[PDB]
Amino acid sequence: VNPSSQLSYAELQIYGDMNYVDVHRLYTYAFTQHLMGCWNTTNYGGQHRMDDNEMSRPWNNLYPGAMRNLTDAIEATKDDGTQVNVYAALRIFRVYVGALLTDYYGDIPFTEAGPKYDKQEDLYRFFFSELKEAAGLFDINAKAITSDPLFGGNIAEWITFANSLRLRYAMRLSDVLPDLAKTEFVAALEDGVMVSGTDDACIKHMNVSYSFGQEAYRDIRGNAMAKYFYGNDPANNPSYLCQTFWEQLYKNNDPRTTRLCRFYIDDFMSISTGDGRIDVTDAVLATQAANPSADVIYMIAPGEFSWDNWPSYTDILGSPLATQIAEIQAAHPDYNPGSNPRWLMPKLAGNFLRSDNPGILMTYAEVCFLRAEAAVLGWTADNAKDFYESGIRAAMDLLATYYGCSVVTDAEFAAYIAETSVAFGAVAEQQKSQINTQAWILHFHNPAEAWANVRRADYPKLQAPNTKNPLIDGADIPVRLCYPIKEETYSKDAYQEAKDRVGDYSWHARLWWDVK
Template sequence: MKIIKYLSLIALSLMCLSCTKDLTSLNEDPAGFTSLDPAYQLTKIQSSLSGDREDAWRYDLGIASPIVQHLGGSWWTQHGGMYRVVEKSHWYSHWESTYPRELKNIQDILDRTESDPEMVNMNAAARVLRVYMFSRMTDMYGDIPYSEAIKGFTERKFKPKYDRQEDIYADFFNELEKANAAFDVAGKTVGGDMFYNGDVAKWKKFCNSLRLRLGFRLTKINLAEAQKQVERALTNGVMANNSDICMIKHMPINYTADEFRGNGRSQVFKADAISAGFRLVRTLVNYMAEREDPRLHIYGGTYVGDGIVGVSSNVIDISAFIEPLGVSPGAMAWNEFKNYGPVTDDDGNQIEVGHNFKFLQPSKYVSALDAPFFHLSFAEVEFLKAEAAARGWAGATNAQTHFMNGIQASCEMMALYPGAPPIGQSNIDALKAHYLPFPSDFEATMESIHSQMWVNFFLNGAEAYANFRRTGYPKLVPFTSVEWYTSGTDGVIPRRFFYPESEAIQNGKNLQEALGRMGGKNDWLVPVWWDKQ
């Protein structure tokens, strides 16, 4: 009986083991990965940074670009153009997409390549990209989860503290210094890289150019530290020409959920007829037109026809037959309900231009689905060098030379838009002539530099917004009202984005601590740390 009993127990045990093995196999995804090549992750991160239509529509085209008076006209530009909260979730879409997706993936790359000598350049590139993504986040929101962020799986930290922006920036500079030292131009290239096709030397220049940008961010709050970081960046080596631009070349792919290879901003413009309502704002249009800026008709075009620009055959380009007009800051096209009237084309045909077609729309060049997105340009570097020279930093003395180099680089950069005509040198020289004699007064110099920087940042609203808050240029007239609409802030330009309401539930204690440092309210009018008033 004992033998039978033991055999029965053994059989039962084997059955349990078999069941466990079967259950384990059932819980394994045969199509899944136990380890993912960091190159695939990097490609996904880079494409989603500017290929996510839903995020770009909300944080940039609907908020940041209208705040700086680049774009208006659309229903959703009320957020940034009128300083109104139409849908509050738009103000934190970037937070809720970036933390669980791009930042999670970049942290995973860092963790898995940290001790691999073959992946030293991948690790360094990931460090730089992590700083870039976090800098955009903290510049929008202020104090954010940083040092304890993305550590729920690795360290069981599910409720990360909100680091002070001052501490975050200090770590940015440490991380960029480490990355610069780690890059090995003789080592393995950066796999899956859509910015530079793996070119380590160019990644190193991007690293230091980003440090240059972030160093200047501190000029209002800590001038000595700003100078230190700017000079270190210039010593380490920044972008030298347009071939160093940090950009992604998108593919001609229209919107599909979770498909990021097309240009997300362009997908918004092509989501509905007449550029989905988006128009260039009069502030930008007039500034450029008054200076004969040849980039204006690369940025915007006047089109007649109820269709998709660059796609529909019934859309006619009348840019050559009508003066460039921008919509009033904050306004929609129907707020200025007056038809333009007829224009005459080269064949003598008259074309009626209604109120909805008279304003510049994003052009067929910048709204192409395969239009590039510029994360950091050589033109920006030259404008920042001009400011360094104006301040007497890094031994630089000729602000005018760098300023003119910036204009030259920005105009030449326009040829990177698909189908865009090259800008002739005579047109570039005519633009430069509007800034002669170059000002000798510091504030007048700053206004010239950063008004041009603002023009250069078209369709990079987040960076234009950050630079405007730092420098105060261009001198924007705040929105107060148009017909049927008034400002949601009595004409005060917002200084930051709202924290997500979900944080009150998921990370309430740490959120409250951060809010306590800004007066106790989730207030979009309270400046971030470096935006000292």
């Protein structure tokens, strides 16, 4: 098999594999409190409900998929001087996937993957030296990378990516190994990290038809995360925003509010096409703003289903919403806006439901936020405020560049950074809060990083669900995924050792880099 094709498979799996990405709908996005209300999200992550099969999704898909493909291709190219470019890229991507896996599970098989679990500390130490080494192996006098949805075989961009991952991993270790973290951070900057959006690491995905048939599960060409956001039952189980994320945007007059979020009446949509959704966003926002003490917009708290805070439509005389609802009722005489008024709860915008949405691995926006925080920590002479503002500007540019959202204007941006909550503070602790809150908005698109970074930074400060719905496996938001149960009866010693190193093993037991 062509080594570049194995690289491509591994790349496309990250957002392309239905069997993998459902972990984000069920758990990750609940834990990060970006999404809530969809049965699948609330029932699992929203109720702190352990399910072996669901928690094992990364393990059971990334190992026999990406990790196996990369390790096989590495074995095939390791002694071939003509193939050093694909060799180097494969080694870098193996680190990327390895880091995902340890950030889910902690100690993991890695060295002997495709035999004890490697310690998370040893893995992170290895990532730095491995990324340095691999980046130095690229050579103009060797064969091209012939298949590569990440960088199209652009060697310079691969080097920049490896350097930038080191920057991420350094900030991850900022609490647990401060001295090493600083050293590695400074080294990464010296080698050269992403300097603009041109250097973004985003997987190109293909426009494919929505399908949830058995054959679709084998296909990784399209963005499966976006497909799951749309759902196999769009008209009754869409992606509702969690209150936490909605309020961060809306209460701060974030210009991204109407880019990321919409209000849709979905009764008349085509399930197969996604056409025919009625967008009432502008009328809903205008009506709430004109009538602040009226109950217009309804929200879904962490741990709630969409039907827990059952809304009520109360027609407001002369309002833009009354006018639009009247237009809908003219076109659909039997339509009753009060019958299923969950359309008054914000949903993910259509821009984020497209199969050709990118698979975001790492962005220049994030590099800005990393450099801002490192300045706040005293690690560098970088201007924290400058990098903070550059990060926000880049995060807003991202929505227009990759998702076809309306460009956030200079006027809109200036108004946003003048907001009291957003304007960079003078106290380092607030500054850290601001940087990581902005990162959390950015990382909506990149759920694994959203969860890793919120666990590390502890900003935003997320409150565990407090609702009438029972929490099944503990009160606090989980801080890891459990090992597959089958590892007990397959890697008895390795599995048992890993749990023993933790102490009181559960999904409430912090990972090594997650310091209380």
